[PDB]
Write a protein that binds this DNA or RNA. Structure first.
Lengths: 96, 114, 95, 78, 105, 94, 95, 82
DNA sequence: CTAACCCTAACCCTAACCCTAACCCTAACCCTAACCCTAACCCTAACCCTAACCCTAACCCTAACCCTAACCCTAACCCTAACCCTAACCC
DNA sequence: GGGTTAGGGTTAGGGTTAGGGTTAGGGTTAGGGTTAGGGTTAGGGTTAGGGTTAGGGTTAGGGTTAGGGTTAGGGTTAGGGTTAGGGTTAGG
């Protein structure tokens, strides 16, 4: 029995000290193949490409979450909002 | 060999052949590849020294991508030279912000009815 | 069976020269090889751009020195320039 | 397949990124952003594979597309 | 007949692009249809840019092409804004798109 | 003195072809020349990269077509590809 | 006699509809020469380079002001603060 | 020796720049922060131009070297030069 | 099924753009004596055109001695309840 | 400055599950087998590329004088903070 807003730092440190992968393998491969089937069908993937794309997406999501957390901290708010991710995507230059 | 004459260990003929095959210029010099090899040797020596320092600080005798990522993010010059560089299986820095903290106890346990 | 570059023996020799009590892995070796290849490609591109801007056909050590001074910040740039000039003088004095 | 990214996955990603509190529509917004990025990357890889007269996307074409987009990746491939 | 402009149905020079590609040391062998393709792409891009500039000049009640009209035509088109993102035009201008909050209320 | 490129006569001819009632200035001509030079440099760099990646020595129309399809977004890419294929067929038939 | 927070839009529209230069010439040239004298002395400038640098600085300042105004609007504040320009410089990536 | 050139950017200049950029309200330290940012950017650009001029075996910085430095930094400029 | 966020409804002042009239610096020119950029060979030494047989560099040979994750066990690195300057602000 | 009074971290003691050590077979690399394929020179003239004079048509670089900012200043009201629990709404 603990109080809220205290045990989150332990999980944050545990996830930051580890360099393992969080996203799965079969659902990500299925989503990648479903997206690739929209352009040209009969496409294959040598696994390594899917892992590289997953690592790139993980790095991009980590950077976006860091920018959103910094913007929320500057805006005097521990929580995040869709307007925060909109401001992040607008200031970073990627679209809009 | 050029390694015993220039006092270096990186190959010079390999860089010269790569520059001649890459079609970068009409004539590639002979001292320019030596200069590039010396610069690459100094950069590799600095990177290996940072990796060894990180491994010794982390109580490890080997070079892992985590140590390289830590040495890259710690040095300000290496962070500016390699800005938008993503290293697979590297990691991030656990630099918690000043606001993201448990802070203090307001009213014992935030209870005004006690 | 083909043949690849794989800059590994020279990196291992440099590591043993600066610290013979430590080693390296395959992932770190691949990261170092990719970094060296990217640095070499950037230097070659900068040298080609300088040669095309100066209306010249040959490439000397001054072009690569300027490319290093422009890519590298300050202290690292001055250290690399000094080490390159020392290596050039050593190669010129000893044929 | 778009709903494959579960809620605990985004929660762990936000905890690793330093986020201490998540709303509700953040999951859907991150899902859409990831879908758009994956679509662009897959389109670039398909164009590269079609230029290389091949079908299966390899790691070299992925590295080339990542370098063209502006985000290099080390370790994977060569 | 004597020039490539009368055979390919274009107006941009092909031999100039071929000589520039041969002198730039981009590849060992530069083709002959590749410069024609590049000239056609450049001609289409120039035609689209000139059409946008003429439309902007006609909307601004002007009979000439000024950098302001080019900047307006670039910032108005979404495709031209994505193709030329970080492009600064001297003596161009900015868009007077006032925000919803910046109002006298 | 010397001799400069200055892509101006062809731009003026294209402008008179699409709209003979309008003109152009020196600053707009310089901006158009810089844009054309930047596009040509980007196309040449993309073609050189594709030739170095495909382990080839020659350059065909397929490399420049792919470079245009990668640089240009969608509608402009498809229009430029169609116009280039039409010009190639016209140059090959005649 | 007018009320505050109303006549600013007129000046904003007047400055946006015009494509003229706001920064002077002699003070900018003096500052550029004073900065260039720190690295290497006996330097000259053909005016056109100073005008190009001034135009680039004007475009950069306009973009930075636009980003700061957008961030302040998102933060529910019409005014700007040094923390806003710090957040802008941190998110944009420039140092 | 040249001095007092950092304070050349007057207050009305930054006010007009903010009005053109869409800023409807300016604080106090914004002027000093913009002055420092402009000084840093000018220092970097001048250093790059000096390096380019030294590589070109020249002294006076021309417009071509300025365009080259702007393209190397990552911000192209059209109209000025060629 | 728990307590700290959390967002707008009570109320604050110190920061904060609009402002006309003493203002006295800079911008179209002006030669002018000091000077860096470009054209004809001179000639000269370093690198392309390509042998020689070399001394050195890539897969594997079976072990080699200090690299994995995890197999019993000690004990203290963050959890929470009193506590002492320190700058903050309104007399 | 000083009227006291909201507000900043904080470390004695309690807390038990979170770090400390730990540990055993094969998992993970490094000095050993060989030969052929690039790394590296050793004989021949040459063509892109350095040294040096002057002259030449500039062009950065000495200065006038008069008016639009220039700041000269203030208000006062307007857009900035300062918070009550209210359900409440996301957190383990």
């Amino acid at each position: 029995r603990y109080r809220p807003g205290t045990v989150a730092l332990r999980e944050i440190r545990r996830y930051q000290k580890s360099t393992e992968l969080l996203i799965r393998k079969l659902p990500f491969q299925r989503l990648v193949r479903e997206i690739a089937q929209d352009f040209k069908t009969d496409l294959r993937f040598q696994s390594s490409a899917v892992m590289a794309l997953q690592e790139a997406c993980e790095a991009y999501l980590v950077g976006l979450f860091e920018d959103t957390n910094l913007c929320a901290i500057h805006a005097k708010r521990v929580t995040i909002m869709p307007k925060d991710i909109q401001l992040a995507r607008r200031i970073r230059g990627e679209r809009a | 060999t050029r390694s015993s004459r220039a006092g270096l260990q990186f190959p010079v003929g390999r860089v010269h052949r790569l520059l001649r095959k890459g079609n970068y210029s009409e004539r590639v010099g002979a001292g320019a590849p030596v200069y590039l090899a010396a610069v690459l040797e100094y950069l590799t020596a600095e990177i290996l020294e940072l990796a060894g320092n990180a491994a010794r600080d982390n109580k490890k005798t080997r070079i892992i991508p985590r140590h390289l990522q830590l040495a890259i993010r710690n040095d300000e010059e290496l962070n500016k030279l390699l800005g938008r560089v993503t290293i697979a299986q590297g990691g991030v820095l656990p630099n918690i912000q000043a606001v993201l903290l448990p802070k203090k106890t307001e009213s014992h346990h935030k209870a005004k009815g006690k | 069976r083909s043949r690849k570059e794989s800059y590994s023996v020279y990196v291992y020799k440099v590591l043993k020269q600066v610290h013979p009590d430590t080693g390296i892995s395959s992932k770190a070796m691949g990261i170092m090889n990719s970094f060296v290849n990217d640095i070499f490609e950037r230097i070659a591109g900068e040298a080609s751009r300088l040669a095309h801007y100066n209306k010249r056909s040959t490439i000397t050590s001054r072009e690569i020195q300027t490319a290093v001074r422009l890519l590298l910040p300050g202290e690292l740039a001055k250290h690399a320039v000094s080490e390159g000039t020392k290596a050039v003088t050593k190669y010129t004095s000893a044929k | 397949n778009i709903q494959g990214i579960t809620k605990p996955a985004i929660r762990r990603l936000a905890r690793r990124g330093g986020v201490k509190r998540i709303s509700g529509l953040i999951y859907e917004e991150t899902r859409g952003v990831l879908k758009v990025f994956l679509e662009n990357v897959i389109r670039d890889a398909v164009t590269y594979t079609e230029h290389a007269k091949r079908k299966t996307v390899t790691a070299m074409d992925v590295v080339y597309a990542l370098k063209r987009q502006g985000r290099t990746l080390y370790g994977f491939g060569g």
